[PDB]
Subunit: 405 residues, 2 copies
Amino acid sequence: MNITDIREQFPILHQQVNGHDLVYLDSAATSQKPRAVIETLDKYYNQYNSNVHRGVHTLGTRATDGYEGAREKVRKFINAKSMAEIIFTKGTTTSLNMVALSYARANLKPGDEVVITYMEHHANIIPWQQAVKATGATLKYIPLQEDGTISLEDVRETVTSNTKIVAVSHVSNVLGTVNPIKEMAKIAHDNGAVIVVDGAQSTPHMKIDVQDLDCDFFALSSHKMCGPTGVGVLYGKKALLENMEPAEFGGEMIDFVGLYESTWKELPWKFEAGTPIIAGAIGLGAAIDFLEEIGLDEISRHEHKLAAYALERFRQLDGVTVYGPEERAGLVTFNLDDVHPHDVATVLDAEGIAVRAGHHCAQPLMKWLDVTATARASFYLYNTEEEIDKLVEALQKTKEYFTNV
Amino acid sequence: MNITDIREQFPILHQQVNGHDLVYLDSAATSQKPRAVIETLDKYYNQYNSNVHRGVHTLGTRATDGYEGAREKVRKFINAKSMAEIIFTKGTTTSLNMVALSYARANLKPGDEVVITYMEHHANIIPWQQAVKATGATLKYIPLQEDGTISLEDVRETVTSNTKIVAVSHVSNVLGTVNPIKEMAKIAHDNGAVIVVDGAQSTPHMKIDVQDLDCDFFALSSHKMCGPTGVGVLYGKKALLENMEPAEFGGEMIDFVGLYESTWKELPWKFEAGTPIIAGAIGLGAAIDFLEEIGLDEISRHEHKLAAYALERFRQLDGVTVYGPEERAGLVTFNLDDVHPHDVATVLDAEGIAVRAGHHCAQPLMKWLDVTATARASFYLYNTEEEIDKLVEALQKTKEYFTNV
């Protein structure tokens, strides 16, 4: 895995910001794209754009084959059994809302529980808050251990025979914790619940196998895994999708439309109303080809190396707190003593370094951590230890700078 | 308005299909894009992709300014009063579903009516069928005149003081009828109803001014108006949006998130959950710049010329029926006597000509027309009378061909 050759394929990395080489450490907010993806969108619009399905003309057939071809690439990439289980959506957040609307609101009654965790992103909190309110069900939270991991004993305690849904992040976008999803799914199913996995931060960075995880639903975003913005996937087990009604209604997802009553297409098109995200889906297929050619296991090993190196170098800094466990995904969320994280991020950008400051869409977790905001550097397949050295050197200089004033 | 110079900007037009120059007459299914749009997406991914809002680093500020900058371009392009009224969605179909979910299902009771027309596309039928079923309200249809137009007397008859919503196409994707929306809005408001306009087929082809039309909601798709796939807009009057709850929930559309309760951001971000369609929205802003530079009035005059020319040349063909009125948008839906429209479209594609065959997502209208399917040629700013001559010559040869066998 050669990082010079990988970085050569991402044109956006090769520029300066405020007279310094760009050091982009915000891939957990969104990833950059290689030429293979950007040129896939260009070839689509330059050569074979047309509306899809009902193919009667040559470009329409090409666009259709491109779109459904990318559906198969996604199925194989997460090891789903069938394309009927692979729904294209505009992103993880819409995918989780579709489960909350079509699955939860149809299957919750007073006394039923939805169980989530304190480390969830808002996308995997607020849909459930709304579904429980709509149904008169109850929302419960699995507690965290002190290092920001989840113990399976707490899971077993929280999940009961009244639990109908457990929803949980695969990887936390703040703590970098990798949650024990396959063992959580067993505990959910033992209790009669389904498990909904928010895979937005795992899919880019490590192999996903939905048959091994045995998750009932899994959600992911293209823009985090070198793919175009505006597209995502909802995977669901086919027997659950078959029984769920559509979340949105219109052309393309019908079989018959009468004046008052309509019937739906088979899966997966039952869940894809209107002209679909044609270019974006084909470009997400190109991103999957690109990552597969590098190897997700290789990208996970590179990130493990960067994270171990970052954690060590952060421990060399006085007056810096890092949140979450030692074993983690490729990101470090932190605070400097006595400097607001927004000011940390502002002065890092003056040195060309891009990081994110705020609550990272995890307000209950910031409350759990007893902080109002944090800064986060996150890494991906094009980042290097030299960039981490630049970050830690800039944090040192930030600390001294705010000391002198 | 020089059509050679306009066509030079669309790389996809310059190729052959089955050894003939491509003749693309399916822009009502989706439009082609000029280099100005495709190179806008390329510059985004090559130079300033980053997640938007909460801007702390230089690329993030650039992407944010690009995204909200395109929101302002849309506001000015439809003459809305405020950016708070301009919501980015994945397309017309999602925009109309958001109104049906957040407005209709909150505001309909038994005895209330939703009034639509027989010429509606499924996107502007099935959401209402579902909202009325959910609420126990009643769905009603405005009848059509024999040429496929709507009379305002029928509107006045159909809409009553129990009507809460009238939903109607601006332009029909099958008949080419331009509906009298501004006078329909007056009849709706006189009765205490709001009017929801499906603008998917008007926005690409003629100036939209939502203040003059006085519509309460207006929906449109980027992919039909030279813009990227996967993006659309919902316009709503601000006082109506302020009272509607979000259709989807997650990060970015919150202000405060507690364990059980959350509060929403102000408009328009209250309706934009999760990382938005960043590249696609910026590219739809580039498409609007492109169309504005040509002039929507000029594009409407060009299409009026093409439609008048097509209708005349179709009347020269024996054994061909054209559906809908003489005064129309730039499309012609038709059937050959005794040839199935799918076979018409197949043999036209063998001559390089791209048209669409089927129900065009308007099954109740096909039933009204007493046909099971139709063929449709549709035109846009890059099409020419020579291409129409090629179509009518091929229809003649199709007729003779199926006669000889």
